[PDB]
């Protein structure tokens, strides 16, 4: 749509394409007023993309009018305007995403110490979105949506509030990227902020092993891969779940098992203990003898992840309590 050297509103000089999406495109631009580079998210001129981006602008503006040390893990929206019938969101410039970070390790993962630093910023971000007056569900947490502030540094910010909604402003049943999709969403149940904590648990394991924890090819495969690690979801959850029978079957004695198709490891036998290599020098034993990667370090990480991957969104660890976990104690 947009040429390099193009000048908008005697303010912005467009340089280059940063990214393309369902929603439109993101470009690098020079702001002559502030005298800084910015990222401009240009929404497509179609009602559907416009209406959803208006919700994104509303939630970012809501976050901005809250001044607390907790808010500075979210990309800053500087302002927005309409141009040639496109909603345009101006953000601060950030660096490359955590998926690019994994790609750069040849998908062998970053250290437990860098994983910790990412976890602690992300838990702080989730604590900020849980502030009662905000109550924002991100709904699309994944490595691609977490950007470094600076290519030299390990500071991060969350981007893409394109799917985000406040608690009790739910639009879509089908949300989150499949690998990072919570059991409650797979099961068609009303969702709350706990779905972001599920995504986070998936993301932290992937950041350390280099590979997605649950890489389903579709929803049925997704649930099967979760069940391989965590077992059959509790009956009290399956009993209240509209889509339980997409994946499971109830029995005379009030018990649930998998529906099987044509030929997974038996439920709960692919142990997070072995995926992390807690007692076998980390993922593929590639951390054998490295400092900050002792069995004790690994066990604390395992405990925190299993609390983030509670099937029950009610008892799943919440951001404040995740920040108090031993994994973050020096
Ligand atoms: C909002 C803002 C940004 C964003 C902000 C600042 C940035 O500095 C460099 C790249 C970049 C992207 C990216 C997106 N994205 C939405 C579409 N999925 C991909 C990410 N949304
Ligand atoms: Cl990925
Ligand atoms: Cl989504």
162: nearest Cα among 55, 315, 260, 81: 55
- CB of 155 shorter than 6 A to ligand 1: no
Method of determination is X-ray
Q: How many CB atoms sit inside 10 A of residue 312's CB?
A: 13
Top mutation candidate among 20, 26, 144, 177 for ligand 1, by most atoms within 8 Å of CB: 26
Catalytically active residues are 140
Residue 241: C-alpha distances to residues 28, 183, 185, 288 (Å):
44, 10, 10, 43
Atom from ligand 1 closest to the CA of residue 94: 8
Q: Which residue has the tokens 């998908």?
A: 107
Q: In the CATH scheme, what is the code of domain 7-93? A: 3.30.200.20
* Biggest alpha carbon–alpha carbon distance for the chain: 72
**Helices and strands, counts by H and E, the chain:** 10, 12
Q: Is residue 327 marked as binding?
A: no
182: nearest Cα among 143, 213, 146: 213
- CB of 39 shorter than 6 A to ligand 1: yes
Please report, for the chain, the start and end positions of each structural domain, with discontinuous segments joined by +.
7-93, 97-326
Burial 207-235 (b: 16+ CB within 10 A, else e): bbbbebbbebeebeebbbbbbbbbebbee
3-state percent helix, strand, coil for the chain, nearest multiple of 5: 35, 20, 45
Instruction: Kindly give the residue spans of alpha helices, DSSP state H, lying in 77-210.
Output: 98-104, 112-129, 183-186, 194-209
In sequence order, the β-bridge partners of residue 92 are 38
- CB of 203 shorter than 6 A to ligand 1: no
Cα 311 to the center of its chain, rounded Å? 17
Architecture of domain 97-326: Orthogonal Bundle (1.10)
List, as one string, the DSSP characters of 193-241. Answer: THHHHHHHHHHHHHHHHSS-S---SSHHHHHHHHHHHH-SPPHHHHTT-
Say which DSSP state 3 is in.
-
Element holding 81 (H helix, E strand): strand 77-83
């Amino acid at each position: 749509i947009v040429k390099n050297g193009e000048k908008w509103m005697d303010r912005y000089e467009i340089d280059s394409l940063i990214g393309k999406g369902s929603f439109g495109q993101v470009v690098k631009a020079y702001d002559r007023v502030e005298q800084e580079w910015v990222a401009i998210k240009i929404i497509k001129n179609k009602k559907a993309f416009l209406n959803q981006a208006q919700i994104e602008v509303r939630l970012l503006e809501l976050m901005n009018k809250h001044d607390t040390e907790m808010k500075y893990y979210i990309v800053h929206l500087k302002r927005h305007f309409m141009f040639r019938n496109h909603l345009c969101l101006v953000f601060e410039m950030l660096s490359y995403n955590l998926y690019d970070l994994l790609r750069n390790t040849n998908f062998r993962g970053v250290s437990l110490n860098l994983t910790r630093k990412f976890a602690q910023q992300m838990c702080t971000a989730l604590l900020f979105l849980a502030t009662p007056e905000l109550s924002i569900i991100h709904c699309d947490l994944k490595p691609e949506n977490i950007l470094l502030c600076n290519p030299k540094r390990s500071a991060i910010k969350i981007v893409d509030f394109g799917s985000s909604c406040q608690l009790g402003q739910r639009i879509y049943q089908y949300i989150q990227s499949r690998f990072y999709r919570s059991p409650e969403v797979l099961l068609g149940m009303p969702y709350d902020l706990a779905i972001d904590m599920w995504s986070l648990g998936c993301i932290l394991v992937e950041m350390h092993t280099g590979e997605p924890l649950f890489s389903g090819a579709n929803e049925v495969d997704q649930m099967n891969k979760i069940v391989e690690v965590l077992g059959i979801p509790p009956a009290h959850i399956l009993d209240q779940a509209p889509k339980a029978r997409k994946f499971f079957e109830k029995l005379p004695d009030g018990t649930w098992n998998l529906k099987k198709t044509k030929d997974y490891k038996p439920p709960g036998t692919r142990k997070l203990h072995n995926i992390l290599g807690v007692e076998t020098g980390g993922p593929g034993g590639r951390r054998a003898g490295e400092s900050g990667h002792t069995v004790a370090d690994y066990l604390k990480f395992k405990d925190l992840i299993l609390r983030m991957l509670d099937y029950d969104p009610k008892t799943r660890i919440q951001p404040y309590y995740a920040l108090q976990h031993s994994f973050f104690k020096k």
